[PDB]
């Protein structure tokens, strides 16, 4: 509905990997998560979604404004972006200027900018960090104030190009949490090109790419059924899957369908006890 | 002169930050007794020889100005801005040619280096003072030697790489 | 002791020419009154001051002693007096060293390094009339300035990494030392290229797009008008 992509291609395979005959559509407020190996475009598709990286063929249309050259900034308006490595993409002299940075250059504003910035920093909870420069913090925090900066724009779509790729478990879990509450509050589409199993589990739907071609597409719970094959697919195993694998390595045959920690616990206690 | 380009405008900023960072950080102790802080001029000269070229005068000037603020003698900031700012431009404008070979870089480096030597000498011999000019000459000559040598050592490998 | 702090940059800009645009003996009385007044007004605590004069002490001694020895008359081997001019000139250049150095230290300790870029943006405003891009230089200088500390953290880790694998930094002489700087310099340049490319795609995709234009997030006039009055008083007598 929101992001229609009929055909997509990239000629770099003759840099960013490659894409061929890619096709999918993103629903409104859908928690989408793209996963794959390294041979996959993935980050290529992430670049193509915002506006950068001019594709040689195919066509992409963010509902309803179509790509690319003249309407690139129009499409880029209703699209938030967070990249890996929070040392970069900060550009601001401090947290406050970083958040205000995205707001600034749209011919607006000055007066109404300040309370919006403070409200965004209050929304991420890092209000007591606006005074501090990025050269003092922290990993997940710079990414969090970058998230505050892009959420200050309040776009209908949000793209996570492996935002948690270079974060500690603390900052990663925290970031995912505030993204969850952000979804709760604003209700918006979140497309996340990542390799984090927790994020993929938080997703409503998961697209799996391979060799520049969309090889799979299903609910994260059904995706997790791939078990040991998940690592090769560029995604960590759920602990329940690790336990099941370790059990089938030892004669015990656990259910083929995916199970959460509660379901696994219940089944285990139901078995012997 | 300036346009400015999309990527290049950012590259200049990052290179300035690098030169200032190296300037504050890296210390090069000479065999008795001074030090060579202006290994930032390696970043300057290299930024002038790489792409470069005229625009590298920003990487030369703004960086040196910031260095004057941070090291730092804030009073000399304008002087350094002019001296270095024109220095990088003297290297850049005189460079091409087509970056082919070492000598092609050897010639403009000599002229641009004198802009620092003569520049700071006149900068010293103004508030000062007959000996300060000589001291500035010696120190900035050794420093120019180190900077140009290191720049010559790096710029080869880098031209093979480098984005644009 | 913070202030505007936009005017302090202009102080740094003017103090250089104001310093030597004054002979005597009288303009020195005005200059010293102004500088010492500023010092007393801005805390201090002469510790950082004397520690600031400490490294340049050799240059002070060298300059003053050479200005002396090459003046009584010293050349062709003969001392005594006549010399007094060289004496008071050496005193002049000594007090000169004190003024410039102490004011440099004071100016260093005064401004916080952050707002200086914005100050530069504000001072480059008239230059807009001269077709010179102000906002591009402002954004470039701000990004550079904010990236200065994070690049120091990078430069240290690179040096430590290379030191960990055999690179002996800092050691003499000069050629063997300059050759040793390469494993530090080469990675930093390529890292700086990746630092910019990722920053370019970041700024493009960010809310700020391709703009360059246009958006920006009582003690001021007092000390500067005082500076004007003092500067005029200096402009009065100057022997020329």
């Amino acid at each position: 509905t929101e992001n229609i992509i009929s055909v997509d291609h990239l000629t770099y395979q003759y840099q960013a990997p490659a894409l061929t005959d890619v096709s999918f559509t993103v629903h409104a407020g859908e928690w989408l998560a793209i996963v794959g190996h390294n041979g996959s475009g993935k980050s290529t598709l992430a670049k193509s979604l915002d506006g950068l990286l001019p594709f040689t063929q195919g066509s992409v249309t963010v509902g309803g404004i179509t790509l690319t050259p003249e309407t690139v900034w129009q499409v880029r308006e209703q699209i938030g972006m967070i990249f890996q490595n929070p040392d970069n993409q900060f550009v601001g002299a401090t947290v406050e200027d970083d958040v205000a940075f995205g707001l600034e250059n749209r011919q607006i504003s000055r007066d109404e900018m300040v309370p919006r910035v403070q409200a965004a920093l209050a929304q991420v909870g890092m209000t007591s960090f606006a005074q501090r420069e990025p050269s003092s913090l922290s990993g997940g925090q710079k990414q969090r104030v970058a998230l505050a900066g892009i959420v200050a724009i309040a776009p209908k779509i949000l793209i996570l190009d492996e935002a948690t790729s270079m974060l500690d478990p603390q900052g990663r879990i925290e970031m995912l949490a505030i993204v969850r509450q952000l979804r709760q509050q604003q209700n918006l589409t979140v497309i996340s090109i990542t390799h984090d199993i927790d994020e993929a589990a938080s997703a409503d739907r998961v697209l799996v790419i391979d060799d520049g071609r969309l090889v799979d597409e299903a609910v994260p719970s059904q995706i997790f059924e791939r078990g040991t094959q998940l690592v090769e697919m560029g995604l960590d195993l759920p602990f329940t899957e690790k336990l099941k694998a370790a059990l089938r390595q030892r004669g015990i045959t656990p259910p083929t369908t995916y199970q959460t920690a509660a379901e696994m616990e219940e089944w285990l206690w139901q078995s012997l006890s | 002169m300036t346009k400015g380009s999309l990527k290049e405008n950012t590259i200049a900023a990052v290179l300035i930050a690098m030169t200032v960072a190296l300037s504050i950080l890296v210390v090069i102790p000479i065999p008795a007794t001074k030090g060579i802080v202006t290994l930032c001029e390696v970043g300057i000269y290299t930024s002038a020889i790489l792409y470069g070229r005229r625009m590298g005068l920003l990487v030369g000037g703004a960086s040196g100005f910031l260095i004057d603020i941070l090291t730092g003698y804030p009073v000399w900031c304008l002087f350094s801005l002019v001296i270095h700012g024109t220095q990088g431009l003297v290297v850049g404008w005189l460079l091409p040619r087509h970056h082919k070979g070492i000598r092609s870089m050897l010639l403009p480096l000599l002229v641009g280096s004198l802009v620092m030597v003569i520049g700071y000498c006149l900068a010293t011999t103004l508030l000062f003072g007959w000996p300060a000019g000589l001291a500035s000459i010696f120190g900035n000559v050794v420093q120019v030697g180190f900077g140009a040598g290191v720049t010559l050592s790096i710029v080869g490998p880098l031209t093979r790489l480098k984005p644009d | 002791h913070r202030l505007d702090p936009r005017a302090k940059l202009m102080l740094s800009f003017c103090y250089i020419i104001v310093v030597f645009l004054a002979n005597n003996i009288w303009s020195y009385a005005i200059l010293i009154a102004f500088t010492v007044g500023a010092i007393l007004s801005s805390k201090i605590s002469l510790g950082f001051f004397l520690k600031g004069i400490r490294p340049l002490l050799w240059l002070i001694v060298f300059t003053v002693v050479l200005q002396l020895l090459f003046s009584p008359a010293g050349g062709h081997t003969y001392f005594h007096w006549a010399t007094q001019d060289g004496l008071i000139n050496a005193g002049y250049i000594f007090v000169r060293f004190l003024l410039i150095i102490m004011m440099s230290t004071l100016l260093t300790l005064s401004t916080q390094p952050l707002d200086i870029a914005t100050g530069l943006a504000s001072l480059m405003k008239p230059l807009r009339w001269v077709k010179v891009p102000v906002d591009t230089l402002a954004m470039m200088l701000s990004i550079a300035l904010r990236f200065v500390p994070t690049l120091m953290d990078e430069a240290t880790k690179i040096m430590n990494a290379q030191r960990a694998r055999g690179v002996d930094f800092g050691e003499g002489g000069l050629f063997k030392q300059a050759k040793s700087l390469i494993p530090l310099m080469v990675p930093l340049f390529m890292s700086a290229f990746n630092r910019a490319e990722d920053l370019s795609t970041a700024m493009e995709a960010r809310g700020y797009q391709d703009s360059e234009h246009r958006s920006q997030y009582r003690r001021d006039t007092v000390t500067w008008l005082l500076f004007l009055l003092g500067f005029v008083a200096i402009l009065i007598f100057r022997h020329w």
Binding site: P169, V231, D236, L247 | - | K157, I158, R163, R165, P183
Partner: protein, 284 residues
């Protein structure tokens, strides 16, 4: 091999601003050891790490590493071979690359200490093939390689020095799950088949649970808990208040404990938990 004795360090010397990055650190890592340092950022882990290769001389106490003996009195010159003895891998080692070819890049390490140039290049090829994959990549430029591959080249460059003690400052950072898995299995491989004393600063508790033989918990410049992972992860709540936590296997073991079954020891790994469940599966 490694042995800290009342070690402590502080930036910057006695003069302000003082900041003790470490205080009273005592521990011993045996031959063929595998220490895993855990803790928050700035908790003194990096200081403890840099304390090994003599990057930071202690303010007090002594550090005995095999034949070496680090002391505050020790000069910088005598600490020269300690670097080839103790290999180190900083976070994101790709940045350390600079040479035009990965062969000369990896060979560059030993070349500083020794080295016969031909033997250095041959050893560079050997390390090239021993690390992850990277067969016959010698002529290829490192900058052309992927991030992970560059990490493998840098790591190979470190391994080329023939170190007896390898140190890893979060080596699996930024890597995809397969990259992290293969890299950790590489570390374990070198550990078991070659030497190899391995120090490992991380945040991933699973790698510490599976590979580490002993754990060092840091918390603001002080080694509070130290011992086998069974001893460290025994007290969950302490870790919880230290913003840390026991591995997923231990958590789920608690989940199965409240229901609940019993276990001879707390399962730190899914394999161990699978064993404990298999025994009771055979019983009931």
């Amino acid at each position: 091999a490694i042995a800290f004795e009342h070690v402590t360090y502080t930036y910057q010397a006695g003069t302000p601003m003082a900041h003790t990055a470490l205080t009273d650190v005592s521990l011993t890592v045996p031959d063929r050891g595998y220490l895993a340092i855990i803790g928050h950022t700035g908790s003194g882990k990096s200081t403890l790490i840099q304390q090994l290769n003599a990057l930071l001389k202690p303010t007090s106490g002594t550090i005995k590493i095999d034949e070496f003996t680090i002391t505050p009195e020790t000069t910088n010159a005598a600490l020269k071979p300690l670097r080839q003895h103790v290999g180190m891998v900083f976070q994101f080692p790709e940045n350390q690359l600079f040479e035009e070819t990965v062969r000369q890049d990896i060979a560059f390490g030993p070349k500083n200490f020794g080295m016969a140039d031909a033997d250095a290049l041959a050893l560079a090829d050997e390390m090239l093939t021993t690390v992850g994959l990277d067969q016959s990549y010698a002529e290829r430029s490192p900058f052309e390689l992927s991030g992970g591959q560059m990490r493998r080249v840098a790591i190979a460059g470190v391994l080329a020095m023939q170190p007896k003690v390898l140190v890893l400052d979060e080596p699996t950072a930024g890597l995809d799950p397969q990259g992290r898995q293969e890299m950790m299995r590489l570390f374990a491989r070198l550990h078991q088949e070659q030497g190899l004393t391995i120090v490992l600063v991380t945040h991933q508790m699973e790698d510490v649970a599976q590979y580490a033989e002993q754990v060092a918990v840091m918390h603001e410049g002080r080694l509070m808990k130290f011992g086998t992972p069974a001893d460290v992860f025994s007290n969950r709540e302490w870790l919880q208040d230290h913003q840390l936590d026991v591995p997923q296997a231990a958590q789920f073991a608690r989940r199965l404990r409240d229901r609940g079954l019993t276990f001879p020891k707390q399962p730190l790994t899914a394999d161990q938990l699978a064993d404990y469940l298999a025994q009771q599966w055979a019983q009931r």
